[PDB]
Each structure stands twice: as structure tokens, then as C-alpha cells.
Amino acid sequence: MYTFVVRDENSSVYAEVSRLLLATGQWKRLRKDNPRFNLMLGERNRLPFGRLGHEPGLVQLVNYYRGADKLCRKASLVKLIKTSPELSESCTWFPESYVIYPTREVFLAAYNRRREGREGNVWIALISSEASELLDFIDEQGQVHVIQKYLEKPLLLEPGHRKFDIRSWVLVDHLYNIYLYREGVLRTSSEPYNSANFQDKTCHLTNHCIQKNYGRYEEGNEMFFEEFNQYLMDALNTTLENSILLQIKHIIRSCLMCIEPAISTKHLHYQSFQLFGFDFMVDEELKVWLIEVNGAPACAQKLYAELCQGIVDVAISSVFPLATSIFIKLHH
Amino acid sequence: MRECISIHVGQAGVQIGNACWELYCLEHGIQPDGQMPSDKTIGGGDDSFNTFFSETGAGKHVPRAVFVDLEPTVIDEVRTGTYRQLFHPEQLITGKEDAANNYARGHYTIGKEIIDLVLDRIRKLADQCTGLQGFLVFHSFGGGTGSGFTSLLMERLSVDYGKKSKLEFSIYPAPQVSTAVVEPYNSILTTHTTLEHSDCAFMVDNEAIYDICRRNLDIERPTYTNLNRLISQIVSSITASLRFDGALNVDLTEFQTNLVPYPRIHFPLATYAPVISAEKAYHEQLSVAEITNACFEPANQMVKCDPRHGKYMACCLLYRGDVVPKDVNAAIATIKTKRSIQFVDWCPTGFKVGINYQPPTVVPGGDLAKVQRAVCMLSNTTAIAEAWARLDHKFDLMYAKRAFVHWYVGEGMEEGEFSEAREDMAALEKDYEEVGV
Amino acid sequence: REIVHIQAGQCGNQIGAKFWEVISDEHGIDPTGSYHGDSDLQLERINVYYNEATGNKYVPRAILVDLEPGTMDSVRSGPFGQIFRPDNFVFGQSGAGNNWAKGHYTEGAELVDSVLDVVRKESESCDCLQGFQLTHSLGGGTGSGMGTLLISKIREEYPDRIMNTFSVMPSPKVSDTVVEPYNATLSVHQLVENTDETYCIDNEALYDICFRTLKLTTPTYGDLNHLVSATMSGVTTCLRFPGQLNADLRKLAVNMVPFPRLHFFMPGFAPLTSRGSQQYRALTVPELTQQMFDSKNMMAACDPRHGRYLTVAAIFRGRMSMKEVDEQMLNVQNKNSSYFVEWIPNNVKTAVCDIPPRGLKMSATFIGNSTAIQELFKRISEQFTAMFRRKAFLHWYTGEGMDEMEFTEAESNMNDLVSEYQQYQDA
Amino acid sequence: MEVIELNKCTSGQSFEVILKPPSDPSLEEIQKKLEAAEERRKYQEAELLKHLAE
Numbered sequence A: 001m002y003t004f005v006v007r008d009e010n011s012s013v014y015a016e017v018s019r020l021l022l023a024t025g026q027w028k029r030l031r032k033d034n035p036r037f038n039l040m041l042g043e044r045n046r047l048p049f050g051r052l053g054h055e056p057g058l059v060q061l062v063n064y065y066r067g068a069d070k071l072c073r074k075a076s077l078v079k080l081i082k083t084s085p086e087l088s089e090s091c092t093w094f095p096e097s098y099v100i101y102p103t104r105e106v107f108l109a110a111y112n113r114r115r116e117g118r119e120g121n122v123w124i125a126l127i128s129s130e131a132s133e134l135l136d137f138i139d140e141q142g143q144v145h146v147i148q149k150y151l152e153k154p155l156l157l158e159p160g161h162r163k164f165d166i167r168s169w170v171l172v173d174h175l176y177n178i179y180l181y182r183e184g185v186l187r188t189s190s191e192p193y194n195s196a197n198f199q200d201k202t203c204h205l206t207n208h209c210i211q212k213n214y215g216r217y218e219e220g221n222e223m224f225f226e227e228f229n230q231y232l233m234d235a236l237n238t239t240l241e242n243s244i245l246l247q248i249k250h251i252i253r254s255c256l257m258c259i260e261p262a263i264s265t266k267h268l269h270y271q272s273f274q275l276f277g278f279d280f281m282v283d284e285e286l287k288v289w290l291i292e293v294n295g296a297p298a299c300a301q302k303l304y305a306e307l308c309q310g311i312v313d314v315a316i317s318s319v320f321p322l323a324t325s326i327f328i329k330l331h332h
Numbered sequence B: 001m002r003e004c005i006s007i008h009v010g011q012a013g014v015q016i017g018n019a020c021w022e023l024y025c026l027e028h029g030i031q032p033d034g035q036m037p038s039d040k041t042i043g044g045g046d047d048s049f050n051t052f053f054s055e056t057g058a059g060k061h062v063p064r065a066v067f068v069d070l071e072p073t074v075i076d077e078v079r080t081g082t083y084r085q086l087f088h089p090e091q092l093i094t095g096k097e098d099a100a101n102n103y104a105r106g107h108y109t110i111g112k113e114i115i116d117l118v119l120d121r122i123r124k125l126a127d128q129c130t131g132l133q134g135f136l137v138f139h140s141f142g143g144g145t146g147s148g149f150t151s152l153l154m155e156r157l158s159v160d161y162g163k164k165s166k167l168e169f170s171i172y173p174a175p176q177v178s179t180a181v182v183e184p185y186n187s188i189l190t191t192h193t194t195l196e197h198s199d200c201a202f203m204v205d206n207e208a209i210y211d212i213c214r215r216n217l218d219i220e221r222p223t224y225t226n227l228n229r230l231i232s233q234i235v236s237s238i239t240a241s242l243r244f245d246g247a248l249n250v251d252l253t254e255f256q257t258n259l260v261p262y263p264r265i266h267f268p269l270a271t272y273a274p275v276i277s278a279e280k281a282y283h284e285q286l287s288v289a290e291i292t293n294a295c296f297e298p299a300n301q302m303v304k305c306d307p308r309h310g311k312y313m314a315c316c317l318l319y320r321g322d323v324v325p326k327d328v329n330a331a332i333a334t335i336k337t338k339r340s341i342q343f344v345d346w347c348p349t350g351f352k353v354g355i356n357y358q359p360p361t362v363v364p365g366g367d368l369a370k371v372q373r374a375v376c377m378l379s380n381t382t383a384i385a386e387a388w389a390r391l392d393h394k395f396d397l398m399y400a401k402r403a404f405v406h407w408y409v410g411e412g413m414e415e416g417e418f419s420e421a422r423e424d425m426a427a428l429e430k431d432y433e434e435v436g437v
Numbered sequence C: 001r002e003i004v005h006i007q008a009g010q011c012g013n014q015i016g017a018k019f020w021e022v023i024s025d026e027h028g029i030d031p032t033g034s035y036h037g038d039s040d041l042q043l044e045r046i047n048v049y050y051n052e053a054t055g056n057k058y059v060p061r062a063i064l065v066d067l068e069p070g071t072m073d074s075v076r077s078g079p080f081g082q083i084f085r086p087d088n089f090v091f092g093q094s095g096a097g098n099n100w101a102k103g104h105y106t107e108g109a110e111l112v113d114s115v116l117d118v119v120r121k122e123s124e125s126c127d128c129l130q131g132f133q134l135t136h137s138l139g140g141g142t143g144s145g146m147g148t149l150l151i152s153k154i155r156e157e158y159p160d161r162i163m164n165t166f167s168v169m170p171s172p173k174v175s176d177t178v179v180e181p182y183n184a185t186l187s188v189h190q191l192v193e194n195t196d197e198t199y200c201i202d203n204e205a206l207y208d209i210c211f212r213t214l215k216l217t218t219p220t221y222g223d224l225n226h227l228v229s230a231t232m233s234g235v236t237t238c239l240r241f242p243g244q245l246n247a248d249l250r251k252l253a254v255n256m257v258p259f260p261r262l263h264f265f266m267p268g269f270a271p272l273t274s275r276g277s278q279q280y281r282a283l284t285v286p287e288l289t290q291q292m293f294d295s296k297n298m299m300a301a302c303d304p305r306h307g308r309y310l311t312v313a314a315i316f317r318g319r320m321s322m323k324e325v326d327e328q329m330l331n332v333q334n335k336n337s338s339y340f341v342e343w344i345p346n347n348v349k350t351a352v353c354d355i356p357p358r359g360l361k362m363s364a365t366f367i368g369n370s371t372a373i374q375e376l377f378k379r380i381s382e383q384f385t386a387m388f389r390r391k392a393f394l395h396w397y398t399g400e401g402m403d404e405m406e407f408t409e410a411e412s413n414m415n416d417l418v419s420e421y422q423q424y425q426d427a
Numbered sequence D: 001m002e003v004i005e006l007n008k009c010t011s012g013q014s015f016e017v018i019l020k021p022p023s024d025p026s027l028e029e030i031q032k033k034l035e036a037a038e039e040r041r042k043y044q045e046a047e048l049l050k051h052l053a054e
């Protein structure tokens, strides 16, 4: 039998991956602190990578890439793009961002050209058009935060005149194969998009939680690719693959290839995989923008069974084999 | 010229000492009887190799070394082995009953009765030195003698040789070859007591050496002899600057200056390449760039850890064989573009490089192939703290139940030394975290 | 590192004699004490158990004790009886009557000083005495009562030496008298305080093994002692032969005993063999490993799955792949990790010896410190209380000067030992 | 790459390469703790011999 431990009871994804493993009859679950495991479904904070790969006679695998946080924290992501030549200061798919420490050096330099050319000049932290009022908010909080150009002309679904974000799930296995789950999900706003006041932000913040009119156009404010594609054909005379998905695969490949030297476990004494959540924003011109990367994402109830089963097939059973593919392999 | 005295404590320290001195003799052309034909100054001299060898009027070159173990069987093999003529009987010190894998028995019960004898034998070597620099101390973390007696000896050496540098070669415990279940206790106890008395310590994890022997030497079940010959090669690379003409790491003080900017964080990581099997009939000789690049693969380190996720405070490259600076710099420029090499902000980002043209020596009939060029990298990286985290975790599991603690208390030790030692380790791990984030 | 061996009483002298037969053959020593062997590994650590005599003769460092001459006469008549130093035969004439009080307080007290005289003479010749090993039963009177009296006096004169015992636990399946639970309970109380290591050899297990596994329908003591001598040869291998470990009794105690009172080991052996019958297929390393951990191969009638292992020492003997041994031993722990306490990391150690025991090409001996050993002491505690609640058969003991209180005290301490084992089975 | 302090001899050479600049207890105390531990051993042994005398 293969052995595994569960150290993040709050993970809906890996809770489902536990059951699948048990249901194979070839996987036994140990107690949190038993060291003689094949697989660690690790905690999200202070995972003890230093204690992995030192158990004689056990091939050990873990569901997190040490060093992947540099991509999955808003402040670190901005630093990674501005300083990595692979992505560069003038990367075309990441919005202008600046890291602001709250007790701004160059942010005001760009914001003051904003007043020059009279261009769109709304930014986000939490949304505003006046810098000195978002900074009163940043410092009356406590922690660091990024301020980023708010995209004023997003692509709006019809009917509804609604805003949305695209969540892509990406699995990276121990060989650093990059697998894009074929099923995405649009996280829509049930409210019409109002550009006259950002203080009212239920039509701007597209989070499924922040939508507490919610459930009107589609179940749970979730529009999946089948329907969204048919829409792009009827409405705009194009496909999801051509207008959006090419850029998304390009962005995913770019991000993950940039940090591969820093996080790869190819020649390590333990092995890693990780499931990422990429969040994309599409603009008026069918142009995709990366918003953030989630290192511990959740799924949609529709897709849990399929995706979690895919994690077992691609990420776990590839290392521990037992006694049609739902992924698109992004090549590199 | 300034002398260095090597001290080997316990089984691991003695058997590793055997391997090192065998190799030293082969590297300097010293025969098992102590004769050295190439030495034209009979009876003395201040050559570089005289740092490790004294000379008799009869032309015998005698290691500046003392061997000490609380039980005699291991040192008895030195007394009757190939190099028995090399050592004067007074440098081979043995008791009759060992520390029974018990730090407290080695440090208190048994150590109190032999420490004065050992210091007198060390004094005998020190008196033959015109300008002694310090000591190189070889021992295991896990043995009762290697841990317990070493810490007592290190304390007394600070008292009797206050101005002398002390370097360690320490064998970190690995279950695949380990002998005792209480080795995590002995490691933390000895590291706590010794920390302030050691200027620089090179840890060797038996797990790393074991896997290197299996992977690269194709030895299915490596023995101590396999491990120690490989360890002696790394030890030799580290001490070559003390035994040969050169400008880098020429005195023990220079090791601390070059490798240790803070006193407590004095555990440099050793990485060695290339390790090639003698049995392999076809081999392609690795270039400077290939062996240098291998210095950043965790599989070639003396302790398995991930330097990409720590910060560097110092980095030395020690080459032996056909190497010229131009190729080193070319290899480094390439490596810097493809690897995660982060230094602390208060340290310059640079490599100190030393090259000895004499290629590595191998013991005839050994497992290591002769190579055209080799390198040992000494980097002081916070990533080595992973090994402390591992050791402290095992310590915590047993100590939470007080398992085996009665054996130490029964030797005169107090329970509070366990928690005192563990707190020092907690502070040490905290130091590495402050410097590495 | 000399060991002084002591065998007391009928059972102690019968298993003790067989032990010396078995290891004498393994070291190439004949009944006359002359060495006619082929390998020098036989002599490298021969001094642990043998003194050297005039003419290059090897004399077991063994002392034979009993309150009646009968069994000791059988030993001196036995095949190797002429190898023991005649002065090391120390016997009375009255016997102990299966009465712990007689061995410990009256009959035994008259003889104990002359046993200590022989012990002292043997110890004074020792370069560096490791300690002592005692073979005895707990259900009788001499080995039980006088044996534990010797242990107490030995500790008083050698407080810094290791005391190790091979202690045969009584069983109603192999029983001589109804008072065996009394004698065993009184002895266990002594063992808990005055030994560092005790191999619990359960006559219940020995009987079941002869009956259920070796298919002997009516086993004798000779059949039981065949299992005992094979186990005793196994667990002393690392003391008698030069290995990677260079093991001794103190290192064994340090690493096997996390808490001083919990020093009672379950021995195990594989492959299980009956006398005068040789099976011809050698066991593969996987089969050796699986059998050695099988409850049916344990010499204490306890279910290891009813507790957890605190520590384990395993010894493989013969020509085999040490890489395969490492893999199989790692396989057992990894596949059954719940039965090894997690608060003692890496608590299973393995040794290998090239010399196999007589009649086998490969063998495995198991030494377990398992909390399931509490089942053995509970068993005896129930049989003890069944009689003691009615004070039955007590007059045999009060007639020697004992008081009921001393029985109550021994009962309480053994029940404490049981609950202390239970404390770490739940941790 | 800044190459500095290059030193050459017949046995080899050494040099430094920079890529980027920056951003005890006394004998008396030992003797007492060893004696304190020995005191504790002898106390424990005296307790045992007392117990064995009872």
C-alpha cells in the first residue's frame, strides 16, 4: 500500500483527493505527524519542506512547490515581473503595479502623467481615482498592499452589462509538466457595470463570496466554457480558444517557466507538485490580463470530481502507480 | 610555518582520521614507515607539510595527531595496521569501557577520568610547535564519546589554548548507518556545549555520503570504509591549503575570516564533485564548467538541503587538477545566470577561488576513479539549518515523553541541561531564519 | 568485556546447559574445552563468555546454582557437563519445594554467600566486567526465590554493572504446581527493580509453538528448551561475534529501555524448527523478516497487535543480501508504522552476522520492547488473585516467615507495571 | 567580473571574483560542574545502597 498524511483539513480540493485515494484500496492514511508517508498533503503555512526526503525506503511527494509563494502573493508577483528579464518591466499582459509600504516613490510619477493626458486614471488596492484617498486607506490598515491600474474598459457580457474574471486551474507535476485543466469558470457579476462611482463595488468585485440578485443569469454566478464560447461566437464572431485561451496559455507558461529554476524538484531528494489558480481579466478588445495567482485554490462543485480525479491520475499515480485526458499540456 | 594538531575522538573520529592520514601520506609522498624521500631537510624544516607532520632525526614524518577513544578496539586497529609505524604510541589513547552511546557518560562519568591524561598528551605535541595555530577535531555527533567527551575536550582547550582556533569535522547522524536511538539527544547536547568553543565546523551527514556512494560509486550497501574514504577526500580538499603552498586559507584564522561572518553561524556546507566509480571502464572527463555546476546540485552536498531557499554569506571554491582561473570565471558567469544564488545584503556576492595543480589523489584499490580535475565548494548558506530543524524535531518527539532521559540523569547530568541545550538550538534556528528571509 | 553467567534451579540449569551446548558449538569448542574450529571469527570475542585455561582450554564463565543436587548432577553428566569449572557448582541439599520464600528467605539465604564467593572470583579475573546474565524460571523456588535474592545481592556488590536475565514465565499449560503465580508475581517485583534487561520466555508460548506450529502433540521440556536455546543463541549474537555494532549489554539497555521499569522484552525466532528434523529449503529474506515479526514466532504469549513497539532489535544470521535485509526491515516499519511509537524515531535497529546457527543457512532473531507484554503480567496477575482472594496455599509461605502484606505489595507493583505499560500504549 | 588579489605559485593560484558589492567558562567552573555531577551520582548510589540495606 501507499501511505499519505493530511495536514490541511480545510482544503476542499485535497479533502476530495483523500477520499479518492482511500477509495482505491491501495492508499492508507496515517496520522498528521507520522513521518513514514509517501505523500504529504501539506499545511499552507510553514510547511516543513526541510523534513521531506529524509526517510530511507520511502519515495516522498508533496502537494506544494517550495518557493511558489513568490508567484502567489500580490506583492511578490509584482516584484517577480518587474525584476525578471523573462517577463520584464514592459510585460504586455500584467497591469501596471507598484508595491506600497504603509507606515509610492514612482507610482505618483505615473499617476501625475495620468492627469497630464487626461487618460483613465482609476486604480485599485479599495478602488479610487484619487491617490491621496487610497493612501489614507492603505496606512489606516496595517499590512503591505499593491496598487494596480484598474482596467476601465472590461469585456461585458450580454444581457446584463456585467463584469467577470476567468479562473484557470493549472496542475504542475513532479516533472514540471504544466497541465491546464480544460474546464475553466467565469466568475461573473450579477450587477450591471457602473463606471460613475467605484465606492459602490458589488458590480466591480467579481468574487463569488463578495456576491452575497446573485444567481440570476446562471447558477451561482458561474458561467462555464461551453456557454461562454457559444456566446463569443453568437456575439463577437470568434471562439474562446482564439480570442482568449491562447493568451492565457501564453501567460501561464510564461509565469511558471520563469520560476522553474527556483522551485523545480527535478534533482531533489523529495518531489513536489502544486495546483494553481490563475485569475484573468479580459478587456474590451479581447485582450487577457493576469490579475493574480492562487497557490491554494478551490474549485467549482461541478468540476471537483473531474479535477481531483485528474490530480490523482497526473500528479500522484504518476509517481505511485496502481496495480481521454482532461488536461491540456502546455509545452516548454 | 604554523603547526596544526588533529584530534580524533570516538569511533567515527578515529576511523575518519585513519582515512585522512592515509591520504595525506599518499599526497605528500610519505611512506607507511614515516620516511619521505622528497624531503631534503632531514630532521626538521618549516615547509607547508610540516604544519601536519613533525620530523625525527631519523627522517620520520610523524602526524601532529592524537587519537582518543573511551574503548580500545578501534584504536587497537590503528596500533596494528598499515600505518602503525606512523604514530608514536603516546598519541593513541584508549580507555577500557566506552560511553555506551550516552553523552552524559562520555562528558561526566568517564570523561572526568581521562580528560587530564588527554590534555597532557596534547600538551606534548603543542610543545613541539614553534607557533601552533589551533586544532582540527574529528568526531561523531551521535556517539557517546564523540559527543560527550568532545564537548568536554573543547571546553578545556579554550582554557589551555585560549588564543588558538578550533575547527570541527562532525558526523551528523543518519538512521541508515546510525548505531543508537538516542543520537538526536547526543547531537543537541554536544552542539549546545561546543557551540561557543568552535570557530568553524564542517558537518557531514552520513545520509548524504551514503547516497553518494550508492548513486555515484554503485555501491549497493556502503560500509564505513566506503564512507570514510570519500569523507577523507573532502577533508583533504579542505585542508590542502594548510599543507601546500598557496595564498588562500593558509591559516585556521583565515577559515573563520573567509567562511564565518557571524560566530554562531559557523557551519559551512561542503559540496564535492566529481565522484566517479573506479569500476566504470568508460568515463568522459568532466570540464571545469561541469564540475563547478555540480557544486550547486543538492545531490553532491555533504548535507542534503536546498540552498536556493536560503542566503549565502560566503563561498569558496577549492579546485585540484587541471584548472586555470579563466575557465573558472567563465563557468561562474554561466552558473550565475541559470541558478538561484542569493547573498545576504550585507555581504558581497563573490567567490574566493583556490587552485592546486596536483589532481586529487586516490588510494590504490579504492572506489574513487582518478579524475583530471575536482572541486570542493565551501558555502556558508542558511539552508544548512534544515539539518538542525530535522535534528531538533526528532529531539522534541522523544523529549516530550522524557524517553531515555533517565540514562543521562543517572550519570550525574540534570534534566535542565536537555532543555537548556534545546533552547540554544531554538535560538540557533532563529538566527538562521533572521539571516535567510 | 566479560559477562558472568549464572544458572539457578532446575529450569535455569537445564536451559543454561543447553545454551552453553549451542554457543560452544557455534564457537568451535568441544566438551573438553579445546577449540577445534575453522574460522577465527569464532575466537575474536570468545572472552565475553569463556575464560582461557591451561593448554589453550576455554572454560565457560558460568556458575551453576541449586538448592538440590539432582539437576546439577544431570548437567555434570550431560554432553558438555565436563566443560564447566567444577568449583562453580554450588548446591545445597534441602530443595526449595517450589516455594519462593524458601529460595529467597530461608533455604536460599544459607547458600547465597557461597554463590557470591564464586561470582567474586570470576569477576576479579575479568579485564572489564560487562555484567551478569541469569537463567531461571519464575514459577519454582530456587531459580525464582534464590535467583532474585542473588540479583539483589549482586546489585549491592556491583551497583554499576548490568543485570540481564532470561526468565521463564509459568503457564498452567506447562505447570508443576498451583503456587506458580505466587512465585512468579513475587519474582516480577524483584525483576522490575533489580534487572536492566529481562527476556520474558513464556512457557505458554513455547508450548503453543511446539503444538500448533511444530506439530508436536505432547511436547517435553526438551522440546521447549530447543526453542529457548535457539532464541538465547540469537539474542546474544551481537555480544559473541564481531560486527559493525560491537554491541554490549549496556548499549543494549540504553537503546532498548526508554523508561527504567519497562525492560521486559518479547523474544522471537525464525524459522521455527523442531529437534531431530531438518527442513531443507532456506527461507528468503522476505520470509525471514515476515516470520520473525509474526506473533506465532514470539516466545511471550502476547499479541503484538494489542500494543505498540517502543524499540526493536533484529538480528539476521547467515549469508544473505544486507541490501535486501535493509529493504525488508524498512518494509515492515513503513507498512505497519502505527505499531511503532512515533515519539521514538527510528526505533528499529538491525544487525547481521555471517555465521548461521547450527542446522540453518539463515535465521532471524527478534527482540521487542512492546507494550503488549502487559498481557503476560495481567495473565499472571489474574491467576495470582484467583487464589490470593481466598488466601489459598498461603501457609506454605507464612510458614517460612512471610506475611500477607508482602503478597499484597508484590501484587500492587505488578499491577502498577501493567498500568505503566498501558500509559505508553495510548500515547 | 572583478578579479582581484590573484596570487600565483608553482603549486597553483588563488584569486577572488566579485559580481556585486553589498546592499568562556574557567577551569574552576568546569571542575565544579564535573564535581557537581559526580556528587549527584554518589547521592543516587548511596540511596540505592540504603534501599538495599533496608
Ligand SMILES: Nc1nc2c(ncn2[C@@H]2O[C@H](COP(=O)(O)OP(=O)(O)OP(=O)(O)O)[C@@H](O)[C@H]2O)c(=O)[nH]1
Binding pocket: B009, B010, B011, B012, B013, B015, B016, B069, B070, B098, B099, B100, B101, B102, B106, B140, B141, B142, B143, B144, B145, B146, B147, B171, B172, B173, B174, B177, B178, B179, B180, B183, B206, B224, B227, B228, B231
Ligand atoms: N562516516 C562515519 N560515521 C561513523 C563511523 N563510525 C561511526 N559512525 C557514526 O557515528 C555514530 C556513532 O558514534 P560513534 O563514533 O560510533 O560512537 P563513539 O564516539 O565511539 O561513542 P561510544 O561508542 O558511544 O562510547 C553513528 O551515527 C555512526 O553512523 C565511521 O567510521 N564513519
Ligand SMILES: Nc1ncnc2c1ncn2[C@@H]1O[C@H](COP(=O)(O)OP(=O)(O)CP(=O)(O)O)[C@@H](O)[C@H]1O
Binding pocket: A095, A124, A148, A149, A150, A151, A152, A164, A165, A204, A205, A206, A207, A279, A281, A291, A292, A293, A294
Ligand atoms: N487592475 C484591475 N483592474 C480591474 N479589475 C481588477 C483589477 N484588479 C482586481 N480587479 C477586480 O477585483 C477583484 C478581486 O481582485 P483580486 O483577485 O486581487 O482579490 P482576491 O485575491 O481576493 C480574488 P482570488 O484570490 O480568488 O484571485 C477581481 O475579480 C477584479 O474584478
Ligand SMILES: Nc1nc2c(ncn2[C@@H]2O[C@H](COP(=O)(O)OP(=O)(O)O)[C@@H](O)[C@H]2O)c(=O)[nH]1
Binding pocket: C008, C009, C010, C011, C012, C014, C015, C096, C097, C098, C099, C137, C138, C139, C140, C141, C142, C143, C144, C168, C169, C170, C171, C174, C175, C176, C180, C203, C206, C221, C222, C224, C225, C228
Ligand atoms: N521452559 C522450561 N521450563 C521449565 C523447565 N523446568 C521447569 N520449568 C518450569 O519452571 C517452573 C518450575 O520451576 P523449577 O525451575 O523446576 O523450580 P526450581 O528448581 O526451584 O527453580 C515451572 O513453571 C516449570 O514449568 C525446563 O527445562 N524448561
Ligand SMILES: COc1ccc2c(c1)CCCN2c1nc(Cl)nc2ncccc12
Binding pocket: B179, B180, B181, C235, C236, C238, C239, C245, C247, C248, C249, C251, C252, C255, C256, C311, C312, C313, C314, C315, C347, C348, C349, C350, C351
Ligand atoms: C532500538 O535501537 C537499538 C536496539 C539495540 C541496539 C542498539 C539500538 C544500538 C547498539 C546496541 N543494540 C544491540 N545490542 C545487542 Cl547486544 N544486540 C543487538 N542486536 C540487534 C540490534 C541491536 C542490538
Ligand SMILES: [Ca+2]
Binding pocket: B039, B040, B041, B042, B043, B044, B045, B055
Ligand atoms: Ca624537512
Ligand SMILES: [Mg+2]
Binding pocket: A292, A294
Ligand atoms: Mg488572493
Ligand SMILES: [Mg+2]
Binding pocket: B010, B011, B071, B098, B143, B145
Ligand atoms: Mg565507541
Ligand SMILES: [Mg+2]
Binding pocket: C010, C011, C140, C176
Ligand atoms: Mg521443578
